[PDB]
Nucleic acid binder design. Sequence first.
RNA 1: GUGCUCGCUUCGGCAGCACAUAUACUAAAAUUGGAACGAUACAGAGAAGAUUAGCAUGGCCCCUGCGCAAGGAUGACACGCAAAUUCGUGAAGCGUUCCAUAUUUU
Length: 623
Amino acid sequence: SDVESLPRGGFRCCLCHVTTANRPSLDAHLGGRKHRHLVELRAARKAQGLRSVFVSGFPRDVDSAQLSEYFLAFGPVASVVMDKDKGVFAIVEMGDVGAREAVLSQSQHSLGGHRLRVRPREQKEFDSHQLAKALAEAADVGAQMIKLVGLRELSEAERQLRSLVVALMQEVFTEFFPGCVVHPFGSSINSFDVHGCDLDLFLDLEKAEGAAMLELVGSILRGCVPGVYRVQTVPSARRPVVKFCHRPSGLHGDVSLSNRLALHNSRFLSLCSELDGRVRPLVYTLRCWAQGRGLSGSGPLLSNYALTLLVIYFLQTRDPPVLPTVSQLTQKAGEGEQVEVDGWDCSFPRDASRLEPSINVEPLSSLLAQFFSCVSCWDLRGSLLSLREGQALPVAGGLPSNLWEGLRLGPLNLQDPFDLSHNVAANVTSRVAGRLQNCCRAAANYCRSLQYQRRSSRGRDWGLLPLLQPSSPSSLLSATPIPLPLAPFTQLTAALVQVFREALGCHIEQASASWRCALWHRVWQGRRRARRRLQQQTKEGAGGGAGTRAGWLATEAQVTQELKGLSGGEERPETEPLLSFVASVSPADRMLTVTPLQDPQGLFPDLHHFLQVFLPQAIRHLK
RNA sequence: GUGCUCGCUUCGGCAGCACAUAUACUAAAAUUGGAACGAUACAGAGAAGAUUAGCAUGGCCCCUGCGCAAGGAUGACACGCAAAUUCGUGAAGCGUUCCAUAUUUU
Ligand SMILES: [Zn+2]
């Protein structure tokens, strides 16, 4: 009854959301642990719900204890839970059906001089376009990145909502703990926040006591904080955390216990962000790209903090240093900023008004291209990327292992600037590292394309748009050479240049003969309608003129000029070509290879099919 | 949220009363690396035992056609077809059973 069919004989489990490819696999799923566990959960939940009662209207600010002991006379209580948000209502779980029947049998209840609302409980079962439009009209790619920052950051209302949530959590925690504060970190304060980002909190006040404190935090969060659900603990890791959600505001996030290192990391990130102007748009763009291409997330992927540290390291290892090394920051931190946590020195200047500006001049487009290229080149497995020194330490030396005693090496090595034994890319497996390298190579060779270099006038998804939309390009390259009519190589190459220049209106530069060709209008389309107009006008004007060898090129040039004039409505300055390509001829077999260079609209296939019909006819009329 | 006030009101609201206050916060740990088993998809090779891989449409493909009627013209895109023959077995896809000095915030 929980199985819903699917095409190709598919089967799915509604509970587990797990598909099966055939009947035996479905039966195995139906008879194995995951499914039974879920049917036991649903059966127990439905039974408990049916043997349950709903209480409202009880006197304001009355604890569950007296209500439970009042209901004790009517039957054996099992669980009483009170509302978080306002405590208006409560649910009393009874350890039987008879007592639930007894309590629902009465038409009147009294407790503490207030008529109660005892009532049976119901049981129930378990920017795609606007972003593109906003980024499709900027002046250039740098403006696109700045606008991406503008429309991807946290809006002021969202900031207010997050601050209200933080204040609520602070209030409840101060109610429980004697003296404590909640320091928001991560995206909340490092100025690298996006819409719907994690709300990460630090609770400021050998392992059993830590586990007990984490369990206390989980119990307090589950039982007192209004609107939170899905509280779970990860007590066995480098930093035990408790995860939660928040139904009213829709937020989710993590709570850690004793990491001041996170606070210092966040302040360092803010200092880097306000130390130069390129870093914030660069990190936002790289995070959006990595999220789109499915290599940044949770688990076996680059955490976005690791991506932020990677782009910071890229900014550090340039010949003109865009950002200073953390060693330089530690040296330039004056007296009073010397602090250390867990035996590790975390010192850097507090205000950006003291450090000299970087002498780096190259804009954000060049920085993005250099990031792609340099990250694609690096020997990630054999090199440790040290942020404190801005240097690639040799991983095989053994020194980086015995120096820090806790460094877990791997396919990608990247040490956070303050913890000396916390390579932040230990999650990444080999497949994810290889995918990162390959996608970086793809982006690197895309950045050299003229589409990323010049904005589109007619609208062709220029700028970051291809790097944001997934649009995995699986298109084959030039595989079909065009056969040409047998002519002497010099005559054939001359006649091709005439046909491209005169009959098609291409700009042609000389690059086996080869030429770069560029087109601003769709000269392959419409030609049948243009020729019929020219033929009608000629038949109305002065019939005559026997067709010579020169008359064919002149007639195709006129058919091309008509197709320009029918689109002249455009007034945009024609600085970017609608389609550019190479034309290349082999000496022996006299075949023409044609390859795209810039095709912002995906129109190269239409041009190629047109040239396959047109060029072997043109070279027949030019013999 | 709704109704009432034989209360102020500026005429919206405010101040009290009445119903209602929703039907929880419920633990559905996850990820990675191993091993074994079941499947059966695998561009998987013969083929669909002379005879399939073709589709139907739309506007595009060129030529002819004054075309005004159109004809071949066959590649792209969208639209729904679906594919069994009879057959073996995977990789980072489906399912099941164990293992891990293995991982989880920033
Ligand atoms: Zn299931």
